[PDB]
Amino acid sequence: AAAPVRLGRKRPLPACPNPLFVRWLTEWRDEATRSRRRTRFVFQKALRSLRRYPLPLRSGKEAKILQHFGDGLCRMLDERLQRHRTSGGD
C-alpha cells in the first residue's frame, strides 16, 4: 500500500518519534536530495540532530535551539508547523 520502512530495535533509537516531525523532516529530506543542493547535507544532519535530541518538540522554537538547523532551516521548519497548524493541526 505504502513504501515499507525498513526499521527495528536497532540503536541509536529515535528520541523524537512524533509522526508530525518524523514525516515532514523525511519529506523535505528526500526533496533536499531531489534538489541535489547543499541543503541535502545540512538538512539530513539537522534531521539526525532533531530526532537525536530527547526534548519536548511542540513548536519551531525547540528546532531553533539546534545549531545544526541553519537560519534558513529554522525559518522553513517553523513555517511547516505553523501552516499545518492553521490548516487544522491534524
From Swiss-Prot:
Biased composition (Basic and acidic residues): 84-90
Stated induction or repression of this protein's expression: Up-regulated in cells treated with agents that damage DNA or block replication. This up-regulation seems to be independent of transcription.
Domain of life: Eukaryota
Tissues expressing the protein: Widely expressed.
Protein localization: Nucleus, Nucleolus
Family, as annotated: Belongs to the XPF family.
Function field: Catalytic subunit of two functionally distinct, structure-specific, heterodimeric DNA endonucleases MUS81-EME1 and MUS81-EME2 that are involved in the maintenance of genome stability. Both endonucleases have essentially the same substrate specificity though MUS81-EME2 is more active than its MUS81-EME1 counterpart. Both cleave 3'-flaps and nicked Holliday junctions, and exhibit limited endonuclease activity with 5' flaps and nicked double-stranded DNAs. MUS81-EME2 which is active during the replication of DNA is more specifically involved in replication fork processing.
Quaternary context: Part of the heterodimeric DNA structure-specific endonuclease complex MUS81-EME1. Part of the heterodimeric DNA structure-specific endonuclease complex MUS81-EME2. Interacts with BLM; may stimulate the endonuclease activity of MUS81. Interacts with SLX4/BTBD12; this interaction is direct and links the MUS81-EME1 complex to SLX4, which may coordinate the action of the structure-specific endonuclease during DNA repair. Interacts with DCLRE1B/Apollo. Interacts with RECQL5; this interaction stimulates mitotic DNA synthesis. Interacts with CHEK2.
Identification of the protein by name: Structure-specific endonuclease subunit MUS81
Span within the parent record: 2 to 90 of 551
